């Protein structure tokens, strides 16, 4: 693949996307979940006492460039998952770009959800204002300062399992074969450390199901999570029923559904009908949108797998366009 290009693997029915990253010298390959919703780079290690036997574990002893650090870390994600351990320093190879002296976080303990998952850790692509440890420079911070990328951006393509899956991240550039038409520039609000944007409105057919609302672009979240009222309004348009746990049950037949359209900075972006259904279990289909008790929306994979996004940490801003398919 090209310089700074990282092929992604689509896990299950568009649950998450992970890519291989080489850490250490000579180094091992790890499957990391690329998450724009957080900013810590942590991986399972041989110091871990409750990690999965299937996870590839970082071994300090097998890396000649490992450097001990006396600090500890602990993180707790929204979905209730967590992990903790100690900090360390080593080289990270991202798509051919060798980041020297990156602060990495070795897990000593991790939630069962991670132990049973498909990834060896997470690669945080959020802003450095939310690293769990103060003073830690993120991979993007280092790619920039070490001159590994000329433009402070990364292009993101997330494929759909129904089309063969896959996906691709390009650090320092983007791929126009992955989207159609012109890219639309959207200003970013990073006041909370996330990639926040404002959606002008959401419509289904001729019905305006929601007025302007804020949200964060999160590659690390499967669904499109909307604030209570907005979610209920969307649900009513499709006839979905509340499962009481933050998810909705929807008709498995999406052939009659109109797309959920978001108006952002003057352009239309949608969640195609097929994406309105996330998973089907024993004849029951769970919707691609859900609800949380937040004032803002978490714009996850349901939306991102339908729209190519160029993240620009420098401005900051994003450029969006419908995926080519």
């Amino acid at each position: 693949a090209g310089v700074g290009t990282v092929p992604m693997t689509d896990y299950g029915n568009d649950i998450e996307y992970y890519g291989q990253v080489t850490i250490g010298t000579p180094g091992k390959k790890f499957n990391l979940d690329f998450d724009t919703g957080s900013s810590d780079l942590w991986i399972a290690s041989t110091l871990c006492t409750n990690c999965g036997s299937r996870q590839t574990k970082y071994d300090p002893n097998q890396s000649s460039t490992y450097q001990a650090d006396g600090r500890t870390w602990s993180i707790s994600y929204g979905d209730g998952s967590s992990a903790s351990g100690i900090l360390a320093k080593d080289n990270v190879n991202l798509g051919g770009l060798l980041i020297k002296g990156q602060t990495i976080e070795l897990a000593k303990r991790e939630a069962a959800s991670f132990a049973s998952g498909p990834n060896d850790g997470l690669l945080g692509l959020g802003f450095d204002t939310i690293t769990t440890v103060r003073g830690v420079k993120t991979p993007m911070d280092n790619l920039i300062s070490q001159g590994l990328i000329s433009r402070p951006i990364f292009g993101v393509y997330l494929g759909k399992a129904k089309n063969g899956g896959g996906g691709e991240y390009i650090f320092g550039g983007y791929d126009s074969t992955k989207f159609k038409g012109s890219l639309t520039t959207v200003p970013i609000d990073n006041s909370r450390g996330w990639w926040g944007i404002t959606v002008d409105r959401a419509t289904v057919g001729t019905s305006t199901v929601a007025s302007s609302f804020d949200g964060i672009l999160d590659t690390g979240t499967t669904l499109l999570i909307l604030p209570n009222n907005i979610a209920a309004s969307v649900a009513r348009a499709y006839g979905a029923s509340d499962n009481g746990d933050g998810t909705y049950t929807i008709s498995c037949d999406t052939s009659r559904f109109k797309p959920l359209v978001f108006s952002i900075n003057g352009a239309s972006f949608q969640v195609s009908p097929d994406s309105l259904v996330f998973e089907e279990f024993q004849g029951q289909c769970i919707a691609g949108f859900g609800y949380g008790n937040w004032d803002f929306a978490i714009i996850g994979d349901t939306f991102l797998k339908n729209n190519y996004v160029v993240f620009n940490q420098g401005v900051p801003e994003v450029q969006i366009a419908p995926v080519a398919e």
Side-chain angles (χ1 to χ4, degrees), residues 23 41 43 58 86-90 92 102-106:
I23 304 175
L41 197 185
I43 55 183
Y58 172 88
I86 59 170
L87 262 53
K89 179 178 178 184
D90 208 337
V92 182
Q102 170 69 50
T103 293
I104 56 176
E105 315 177 17
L106 315 179

Side-chain angles (χ1 to χ4, degrees), residues 183-195:
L183 291 172
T184 299
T185 297
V186 182
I188 286 288
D189 169 8
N190 65 345
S191 61
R192 292 190 56 58
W194 292 307
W195 296 85

Side-chain angles (χ1 to χ4, degrees), residues 207-255 257-288:
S207 294
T208 299
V209 294
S211 48
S212 60
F213 61 94
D214 289 344
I216 65 175
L217 301 179
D218 188 1
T219 58
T221 293
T222 305
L223 308 173
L224 167 57
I225 300 178
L226 309 161
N228 296 165
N229 295 336
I230 301 180
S233 186
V234 172
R236 287 195 295 276
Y238 293 115
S241 73
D242 197 320
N243 293 161
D245 59 357
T247 70
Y248 293 99
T249 289
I250 193 169
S251 173
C252 285
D253 184 7
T254 52
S255 67
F257 290 156
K258 280 182 170 55
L260 172 56
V261 182
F262 279 3
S263 184
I264 305 174
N265 206 57
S268 291
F269 302 96
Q270 50 169 273
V271 169
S272 63
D274 57 284
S275 295
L276 293 174
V277 172
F278 161 51
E279 182 177 297
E280 170 182 354
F281 185 59
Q282 295 180 297
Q284 286 290 65
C285 288
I286 300 302

Side-chain angles (χ1 to χ4, degrees), residues 4-53 55-255 257-294 296-325:
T5 298
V6 180
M8 305 300 287
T9 296
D10 182 348
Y11 179 71
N13 288 161
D14 309 338
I15 300 174
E16 62 160 89
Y17 304 72
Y18 62 80
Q20 278 192 172
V21 182
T22 301
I23 304 175
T25 303
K28 279 205 186 77
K29 287 182 172 59
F30 301 80
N31 293 312
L32 306 181
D33 183 1
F34 289 29
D35 184 16
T36 60
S38 63
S39 309
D40 285 30
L41 197 185
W42 71 265
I43 55 183
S45 74
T46 59
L47 294 168
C48 191
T49 53
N50 71 337
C51 280
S53 63
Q55 286 177 294
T56 292
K57 308 175 184 60
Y58 172 88
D59 185 340
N61 305 331
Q62 292 188 297
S63 181
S64 60
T65 42
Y66 164 83
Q67 171 54 54
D69 188 298
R71 295 169 293 176
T72 61
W73 64 281
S74 178
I75 191 172
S76 181
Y77 304 84
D79 62 2
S81 63
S82 69
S84 66
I86 59 170
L87 262 53
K89 179 178 178 184
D90 208 337
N91 304 331
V92 182
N93 189 312
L94 196 58
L97 302 174
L98 184 66
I99 304 168
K100 298 183 181 180
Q102 170 69 50
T103 293
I104 56 176
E105 315 177 17
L106 315 179
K108 290 177 71 170
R109 302 288 291 175
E110 85 185 341
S113 56
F114 287 121
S116 299
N119 51 69
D120 305 313
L122 273 60
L123 186 295
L125 291 172
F127 292 83
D128 62 28
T129 48
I130 57 171
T131 55
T132 66
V133 174
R134 195 170 297 184
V136 172
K137 296 297 187 292
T138 60
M140 268 299 284
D141 277 357
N142 292 322
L143 288 172
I144 298 171
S145 66
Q146 286 177 41
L148 294 171
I149 57 178
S150 46
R151 291 164 297 182
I153 65 175
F154 57 95
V156 179
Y157 165 67
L158 303 183
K160 298 182 178 180
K162 87 171 195 299
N163 294 168
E168 184 166 289
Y169 275 67
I170 300 176
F171 294 84
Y174 58 90
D175 180 5
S176 62
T177 64
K178 298 305 191 302
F179 60 89
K180 52 184 179 183
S182 298
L183 291 172
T184 299
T185 297
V186 182
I188 286 288
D189 169 8
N190 65 345
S191 61
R192 292 190 56 58
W194 292 307
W195 296 85
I197 60 169
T198 290
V199 180
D200 297 327
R201 65 177 177 292
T203 64
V204 177
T206 52
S207 294
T208 299
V209 294
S211 48
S212 60
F213 61 94
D214 289 344
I216 65 175
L217 301 179
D218 188 1
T219 58
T221 293
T222 305
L223 308 173
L224 167 57
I225 300 178
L226 309 161
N228 296 165
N229 295 336
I230 301 180
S233 186
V234 172
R236 287 195 295 276
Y238 293 115
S241 73
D242 197 320
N243 293 161
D245 59 357
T247 70
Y248 293 99
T249 289
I250 193 169
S251 173
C252 285
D253 184 7
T254 52
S255 67
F257 290 156
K258 280 182 170 55
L260 172 56
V261 182
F262 279 3
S263 184
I264 305 174
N265 206 57
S268 291
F269 302 96
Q270 50 169 273
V271 169
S272 63
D274 57 284
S275 295
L276 293 174
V277 172
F278 161 51
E279 182 177 297
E280 170 182 354
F281 185 59
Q282 295 180 297
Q284 286 290 65
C285 288
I286 300 302
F289 61 90
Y291 62 83
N293 222 180
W294 291 292
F296 57 97
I298 302 179
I299 306 175
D301 298 344
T302 289
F303 175 85
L304 298 170
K305 64 191 186 189
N306 282 289
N307 297 276
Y308 189 96
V309 182
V310 180
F311 293 79
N312 185 317
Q313 179 176 298
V315 183
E317 59 175 34
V318 292
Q319 287 177 289
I320 313 175
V323 299
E325 69 173 303

